[PDB]
Design a protein around this ligand. Structure first.
Ligand code: CL
Length: 345
């Protein structure tokens, strides 16, 4: 028997804490979740719930009568989120049998020890250990701290309704998750959703004010093309969290329109070396002159490291002006995924 009702002595009120993390700039580390340019980001504003009241009864049960948790592992598409989610309505036909929705959660890796809950107003969740002893209750967010690696709690609007959003990390072991109603006479708030395995990948963006690809190239009066190695930016993550940041994209905003380089150059090529590799890459021009210069598929790993830059000016055919020059300059933006409940809340 799963005793949710009776209070425990080993329960202490938990404190919601997330690290205050800042991405620094100054003028290789792989990601622990395998996140990359192909991973699908998680958006609370996109999360949909099934209108099917009996959704919980569609889940297969173990020989012991539990529903096994989903396992979020580097989602590359919607189908991956659909199968990793466990959701239900506590006013369904299945609720009265054992007075709750009973799940099993297995944690074997510290990097896949996450549980993220999304509870509507009439839902309470309880977590039991392998001996069926209560180690967590969401009602007042109390638990046995020795089982927790981390704890975070907030509120998000999911499918037009306010949800209690909880993200926690457990030590390795076998666990049971039970969902019970707050008030059996409530008119609404009977839905719950949850994800186990990896934390949710959250898309983040950061633009640096330090100028990249910034140089004045003066025509050498003989060659048809001239190159110059430009600024290298060192991007730093707070110590020991380098592996939490996962680089998904690089964009360079061209800031040189006012120098009208088109008057003496046929084109300008822009290159960069991402933090996640040692080789140079030609940046793709999204449009014409002064359009964004992108790497939509950078090598996977941490945003931490050095970003080198270089440019190649191709002079116009018929170039004859002695003091002809090009002044180039871009500002860098990085697109990356970070874990919900660890880096962002
Ligand atoms: Cl990829």
């Amino acid at each position: 028997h799963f005793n949710t009702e009776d209070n425990d002595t080993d329960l202490t009120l938990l404190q919601s804490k997330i690290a205050t993390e800042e991405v620094t700039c100054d003028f290789r580390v792989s990601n622990k979740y395998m996140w990359s340019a192909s991973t699908m980001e998680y958006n609370f504003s996109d999360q949909k719930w099934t209108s099917n009241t009996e959704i919980f009864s569609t889940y297969a049960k173990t020989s012991e009568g539990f529903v096994m948790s989903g396992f979020l592992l580097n989602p590359k598409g919607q189908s991956n989120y659909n199968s990793a989610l466990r959701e239900g309505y506590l006013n369904d036909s299945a609720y009265d049998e054992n007075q709750g929705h009973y799940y099993q959660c297995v944690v074997s890796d510290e990097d896949c020890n996450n549980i993220t809950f999304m509870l509507e107003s009439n839902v309470n969740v309880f977590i039991f250990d392998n001996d069926i002893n209560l180690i967590y209750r969401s009602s007042d967010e109390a638990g046995v701290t020795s089982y927790f690696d981390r704890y975070y709690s907030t509120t998000k609007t999911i499918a037009g309704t306010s949800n209690k959003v909880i993200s926690l990390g457990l030590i390795d072991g076998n666990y049971y998750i039970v969902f019970k109603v707050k008030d059996a006479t409530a008119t609404t708030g009977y839905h719950y959703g949850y994800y186990a395995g990896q934390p949710l990948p959250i898309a983040q963006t950061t633009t640096f004010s330090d100028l990249t690809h910034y140089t004045t190239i003066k025509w050498n009066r003989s060659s048809s093309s001239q190159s110059a190695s430009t600024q290298t930016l060192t991007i730093n993550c707070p110590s020991g969290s380098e592996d939490e940041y996962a680089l998904t994209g690089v964009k360079f905003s061209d800031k040189s329109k006012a120098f009208a380089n088109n008057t003496y150059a046929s084109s300008i090529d822009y290159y960069y070396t991402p933090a996640t590799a040692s080789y140079s890459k030609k940046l793709a021009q999204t449009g014409g002159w002064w359009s964004d210069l992108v790497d939509n598929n950078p090598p996977s790993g941490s945003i931490d490291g050095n970003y080198a830059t270089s440019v190649t000016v191709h002079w116009v055919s018929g170039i004859s002006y002695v003091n002809a020059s090009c002044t180039t300059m871009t500002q860098m933006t990085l697109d990356y995924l970070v874990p919900f409940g660890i880096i962002v809340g």
